Design an enzyme around this catalytic site. Sequence first.
Site, PDB file in Angstrom:
ATOM      1  N   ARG A  21     -12.761   3.672   7.074  1.00 54.02           N
ATOM      2  CA  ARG A  21     -13.874   4.552   7.412  1.00 54.02           C
ATOM      3  C   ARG A  21     -14.963   4.530   6.347  1.00 54.02           C
ATOM      4  O   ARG A  21     -16.143   4.650   6.684  1.00 54.02           O
ATOM      5  CB  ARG A  21     -13.372   5.976   7.640  1.00 54.02           C
ATOM      6  CG  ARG A  21     -12.385   6.475   6.604  1.00 54.02           C
ATOM      7  CD  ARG A  21     -11.416   7.458   7.235  1.00 54.02           C
ATOM      8  NE  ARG A  21     -10.202   7.632   6.449  1.00 54.02           N
ATOM      9  CZ  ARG A  21      -9.283   8.555   6.694  1.00 54.02           C
ATOM     10  NH1 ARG A  21      -9.409   9.407   7.698  1.00 54.02           N
ATOM     11  NH2 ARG A  21      -8.210   8.627   5.910  1.00 54.02           N
TER      12      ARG A  21
ATOM     13  N   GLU B 123       0.840  -1.196   0.000  1.00 54.65           N
ATOM     14  CA  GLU B 123       0.000   0.000   0.000  1.00 54.65           C
ATOM     15  C   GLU B 123       0.874   1.245   0.000  1.00 54.65           C
ATOM     16  O   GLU B 123       1.322   1.698   1.069  1.00 54.65           O
ATOM     17  CB  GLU B 123      -0.945   0.003   1.200  1.00 54.65           C
ATOM     18  CG  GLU B 123      -1.709   1.301   1.388  1.00 54.65           C
ATOM     19  CD  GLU B 123      -2.026   1.582   2.835  1.00 54.65           C
ATOM     20  OE1 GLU B 123      -1.717   0.722   3.682  1.00 54.65           O
ATOM     21  OE2 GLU B 123      -2.576   2.664   3.126  1.00 54.65           O
TER      22      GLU B 123
ATOM     23  N   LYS C 119      -2.582  -1.834  -3.004  1.00 56.68           N
ATOM     24  CA  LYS C 119      -3.547  -1.016  -2.273  1.00 56.68           C
ATOM     25  C   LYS C 119      -3.200   0.454  -2.467  1.00 56.68           C
ATOM     26  O   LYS C 119      -2.713   1.121  -1.548  1.00 56.68           O
ATOM     27  CB  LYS C 119      -3.560  -1.397  -0.792  1.00 56.68           C
ATOM     28  CG  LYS C 119      -4.667  -0.773   0.034  1.00 56.68           C
ATOM     29  CD  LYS C 119      -4.707  -1.400   1.417  1.00 56.68           C
ATOM     30  CE  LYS C 119      -5.783  -0.778   2.279  1.00 56.68           C
ATOM     31  NZ  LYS C 119      -5.818  -1.376   3.638  1.00 56.68           N
TER      32      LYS C 119
END
Lengths: 339, 339, 339, 339
Positions: D300, D184, D226
Amino acid sequence: HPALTPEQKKELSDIAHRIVAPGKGILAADESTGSIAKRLQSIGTENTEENRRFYRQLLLTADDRVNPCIGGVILFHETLYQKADDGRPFPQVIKSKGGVVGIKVDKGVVPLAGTNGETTTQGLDGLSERCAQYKKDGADFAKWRCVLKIGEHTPSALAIMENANVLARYASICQQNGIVPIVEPEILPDGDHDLKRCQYVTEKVLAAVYKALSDHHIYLEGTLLKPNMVTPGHACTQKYSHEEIAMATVTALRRTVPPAVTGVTFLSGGQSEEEASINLNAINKCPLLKPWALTFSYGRALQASALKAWGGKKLKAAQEEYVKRALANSLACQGKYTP
Amino acid sequence: HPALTPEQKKELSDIAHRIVAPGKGILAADESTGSIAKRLQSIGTENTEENRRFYRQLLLTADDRVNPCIGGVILFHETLYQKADDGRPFPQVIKSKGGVVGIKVDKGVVPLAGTNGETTTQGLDGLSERCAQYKKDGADFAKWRCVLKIGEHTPSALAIMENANVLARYASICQQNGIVPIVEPEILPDGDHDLKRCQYVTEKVLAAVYKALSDHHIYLEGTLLKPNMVTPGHACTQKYSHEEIAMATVTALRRTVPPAVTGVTFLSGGQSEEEASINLNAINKCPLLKPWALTFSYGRALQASALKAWGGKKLKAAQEEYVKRALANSLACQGKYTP
Amino acid sequence: HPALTPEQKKELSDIAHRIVAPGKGILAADESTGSIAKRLQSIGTENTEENRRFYRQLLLTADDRVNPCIGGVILFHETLYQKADDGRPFPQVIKSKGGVVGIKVDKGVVPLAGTNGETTTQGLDGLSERCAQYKKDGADFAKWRCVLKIGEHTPSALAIMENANVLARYASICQQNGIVPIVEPEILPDGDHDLKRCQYVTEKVLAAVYKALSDHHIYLEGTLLKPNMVTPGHACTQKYSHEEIAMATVTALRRTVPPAVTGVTFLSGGQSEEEASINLNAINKCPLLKPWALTFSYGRALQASALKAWGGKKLKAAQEEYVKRALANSLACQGKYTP
Amino acid sequence: HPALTPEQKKELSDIAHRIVAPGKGILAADESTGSIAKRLQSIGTENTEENRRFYRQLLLTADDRVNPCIGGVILFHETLYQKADDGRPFPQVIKSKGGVVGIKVDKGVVPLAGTNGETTTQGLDGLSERCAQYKKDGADFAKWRCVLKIGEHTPSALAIMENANVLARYASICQQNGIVPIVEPEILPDGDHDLKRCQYVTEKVLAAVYKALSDHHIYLEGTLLKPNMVTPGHACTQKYSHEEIAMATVTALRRTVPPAVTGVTFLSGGQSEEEASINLNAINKCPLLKPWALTFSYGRALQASALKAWGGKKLKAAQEEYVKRALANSLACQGKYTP
C-alpha cells in the site's frame, strides 16, 4: 526490566571500542599455572612465582612501538595483583601504556557425561562477586574459554548448547558488573577435519552462541568475539591456501556474527606466529564486507619467539622479538602486513 | 560413549529406591546458616554451631518409630562432618537408623540479568570434586534448589531453560560421582496465581526440566524429583479443596514426569504441617495412575512442631512432636493418613 | 488461553480410552494408493479402485467377534467414502462392529535440505478444515507418519526437532477439531544399528517429540503414541531375545513417555506376524510398571496372511486368517498370547 | 551433504543481488483475493479478474524511469498466469525491464491453539513442486508472511519458534528449487506497545528466525529479510522522531541480522506512503555501519495513491503517481530522499 541501563551500555561499548580500536589487538597473557609451567619448561625455566612475574613483566613493559599496537592485555588472577620490579602494578602498567586490563575468569573445563570426550567450562560460581572485584582492580574485560572438538560425532548438540549457555551466563554476569565479556567458542584444530567441515562446525557453534547471547539479553555492542580462524585439522592431509582459509573464516563470521559485535579477536589455535599473522592479514584483505574490528588475540603467536629469545636469563632481545611480532600482527589486523 | 555403566546405573537405582520406599520419605534438614539463624531467632535462641548441632541431634537422633518412616535425610555441608554428642557422626547415625545421607550442593540463587526478578542457581564449580568427597563422606544423594516465580511475565523462557540446564548439569555431575541427584524445580507460591495457572507453570517447568535431563543423558531411574504441590499463591482468594489440589498436582506430574523417575518427593512451600500432610494424603489417594513414589521432602512442615516444642532449652517433647509429624507424613505417603 | 475446553478434553480422553481399551488394538488399513498398489502387486493382482475396496471389504467385514480385539482402524481419504457392497459405508461398518474410525492425514515425506536422507512430512495445509470434514464423516482419531532413520550421523538434530514440531502442529490441529492425534515417530529399522543405539535414538526422538507436544499445549490424555519396537537394524549381527527386546522397548518408553498418554500403539516394523505378536506379548509381560495401554497398531503385521490367503479370492479364508491374527494380537496385548 | 551446490549458491546470491542492487527496491504487488477485493471495494469498483488484471497491468507496465527503481515485484498465482494489454505474460513484462519476478507462496495464516490470538502461516505442502513450477514460470524469488502480534503475553515462545521453524522450512524448500526466499517475520503495529518494546520483540523474533535458518542450513547470502520498521504501536502515546525510529530499527537489525543477508527490504506495516519513505530515508541515513542493502518492499505504501488516482478509469495519472512514489522510495533506499 532491561538487563543494563544506557549508562552501562555506553560504558561497555566504549571499553569494547577502546579494546578493538583500529590497529589494536589483544595480548593473551592469561596462561594458567599449568600452561605457563609447560611454557617455561619448554625453555628450561622453572615454574616459580618470581619467574612467572618476571616473564609477564618482560612481556607487558614493552615500548612506544607496541603503545599503539595492543588494545588490551588479558592477565590471570595472580598476575592482576603482581607488581613489576619498578613497583607499579601490572594493570597500572597496561593502562599507562594505553592498554585495557583483562582477566581470564575461567575455572577450567570439566567433562560432560554421555559424550565422546567433550568438555564444558566452569567458573560461574561467585563470578559476579569476583568480576566486581576485578573491575575494582582495574580490569575492564574478561575472557571465557569453551573448547569444542571436531570428531566423528562432535561437537554434539548437548556440548554446543551447553557451551553457548555457559558463555551467555558468563557474558550476562560480566556485563552486569561492567566487565566487557569476550566470548571464546574455541573449536580445537585437533583432528583430520577439512576446511569445509571446520567452517560448518564454526557456523553452527557461533549460531548457537549468538542465539544464547540473545536469549540471555546480552548487550552485543559491549561484547567481543574470540573465535578461531577456520583452518583445517592438524591431521588434514589436504593443504588449503591462505586466502582460501581467510575467505572461509570471513564467510563463517559473516553468516553468523551480527554487526552489533564491536570486534572479532581471533586466536592462533596452535599455529605458528608467521602463519597466524599472514592468516589475519589475508582475513583483513578478504574482498568482502566485514562490519567488525577483525583484530587479533594471540597467546603463543605473540609469546613463542619472545620465550625462545628469553630462555629464562634476566631481556631486551625477547622484548624486541615480542614487539616485532605485535607490530606484524597489528599490520595484519590493519590489512597492511607483508610476510 | 554412554554416561554411566550398568553397575553405576544399578547402584544409583538402588540408592533411589532406598530413598523412596513405601511410606519412607525425606527430611529436609539442609537449612543453611542464614535459614537456621532465622529459625533460631524465631524461637529466640542464639545462632551457634553448637545450637545447629543440637538441632540436628534433636531431629536425626530418634526412636525406632522414625526408622520405617524416613527414607533419607539431607544435611548441610557443615552438618555432614558434625558428630552427635554421643560421638557418632551424623551420616553414621542416619545409616544406623536405616536412613540414607543427603547433602545440599547449592551455592545460592544468583540473579538473572534482564529478567523480572528471576534467579538462577549456582554451585557447579568443583561440584564433581566435592560430590566425590561427599560420596566418600557417606552422602549418597544430593539436592539442587532452583527458584522460579509466577509473576506477570515470569517464569520467562530464559529463566525456565537456564534453570533446567543448570539442574541437568548438576544431575550429570552427581550421577558421574555416584550420587543420586534430587532435581528440585521450585515454583514459588508467591503471588495471586490461581491453581490452574500454577498447574500450567509447573507443567511447562517440568517439561523443560525433563527435556534438559534427556539432553544431558541423565539416568532418570537414578534421580528423584522434588517439585512443589500445585497450589495457589498465598494471595489467591479462590480456595481450592485438598482433593482438587491433589488432582491438579498429580495431573501436572502425569503430563510431564516420565515413569522412569523412581519417586517424587514433594516440598511444602509455606504449607502448615497438617495441611501439607493432608495434601500428600490426597495426592496418594488420587484415583489417577501414579507410577512414582509420591513421598515427602518436608522441612519446615516436618520440624515446625519440633522447633515450637524445643524452644532452645536442652528435648524429648520436641522429639515426640517430630515423631508425630514424621509418622503422619509417612501415612500420607502411603495414602492412609487422617487429621 | 486454554487450547481445549474441559468438554473438548473429556471427549478426546473418551475417544482415546475407547481406542486403547484393554485388549483392543489398532488395524492400520491406511495404505495410500501407491502403497496398496505395491502391496497388491506383491501378490500380483491389481491396483484398481474397486479391487482395493474389496481388500478393506474383507478386512473390516470379516467376523462378528473381532470387536474385543481391535478397537480402531486407520483408513484413508479414499477408504473413508468407499462403501461396503451391501450399501453400508466403512465408517458405519467399524462403528457397528464396535470400533472407532481413524484416518491418516499425511501428505507424504519430503526431503530436508542439508542433511543425509532425512525426510520431514507435509499435510498441515488445510488440516483444520479437512479434520473437521473427517469428524463429520465419522473419523475420531488421526494419524501422522514421521520417519527417522538411524545412520552414521542420523537422526540429526534438525530432523528430530522438525519432525517433533510438525507432529505437535498436527496434534494441535487435530485436538482443536476434536480428533485424537496419534503421534507416530517412525524410526526406520533399516541399517545395522544395534539395540542400544536404537534405544538411545528412540529415547532422544521421543523426548523431543514430547517436549514439542508440551510446547504446543497438546492435551496428552487425548493423544496416542505410535512408536516402533526398540529393535536392532535389519543388518545387526547380534541376536536379541524377545523378552530382552521388550525390556529395551519398555525402558525406552518409561524413560520418556509421561503417564498422561492414554496408550502406546506399537508399529509392525515390517516384521513377521508371529514374531511381532510375541514381541508385543513380551512387552506386556515386562516385569516393570507401564502406565499406558501398550496395544498394537499393525499394518502388514495383520495383513500379510490375509493377503496370501486372499490373492484375489472373491474371501472367507483370508477373513478367518486375519481374524485369527487379530485374536492372537489381542491376546498378546493382554500378555496372554502363546506362539 | 550440503543443502546447495556451489552453482545453486552462486545463482541464489546473484538473484538476491539483482533484487537489491543499489537504488532498487521491491514492489509488493501481491494481494490475496480477499485483500484485493477489500481494496477495490474501498475505491468502489468490483472485484473480478476484469479490474484485478488491469490493476496489476497498471502497476507493472509503467514508465521507463521506474526501471532502476524497482528490483523485484512480488506477485500472486493469478498475476503469474495473467497477461497484460500487449498479450504478454506479467512475469516476462517484469523481466527484460530490470525487475525480478516474485510470488507469494503462502496459503494463509492458521491459528495456534493454546495461545492468545497468535497465528502460523501455512503453505509448506507441495511447496517444492509448486516452487519448481514457479521457477519454470519466470519467478525467481518468493515471499512468506508470518504474523506476530505484540500483546500482554505475546509474542509467546511457541509462536516465535513455530513461525521461525516454518520460515526456515519455506526458505530451505525455495533454495532447493532455486527460488530466493524472502523471510518476512511480520510483527503487527497493532496495539499500544512502546518503541522499546517493539525493538525488543523484533530483536527476539529476528534472533529466533536466524537461529532457525542456521538450523535448517539456509544459505543466507541467497535470502532476503523483510522485517517491519521498529515503530510504536497504533495506540502508543509517545511520539518518536523519524531519526529515533531509524536508530531503533537499524539497531534491532544490527543485533540480530548477520551480514551474509544480501539485503533488508522493509514493509510499511499500515503507515502512510510519505511516512514510510521518510522512515526508510532516515534508516539509510543512520550514522551506523549497516552491511545490507536496506531497501523497500512496499505494498500500500506504493499503491494507495496510485489506486486512488486510478479509481477504474482505464490510467496515465495513476501510472505517474505510482512512478513518483517508487522514485521517492528508491531515493530513500539510496539515502538521498527529501520531501
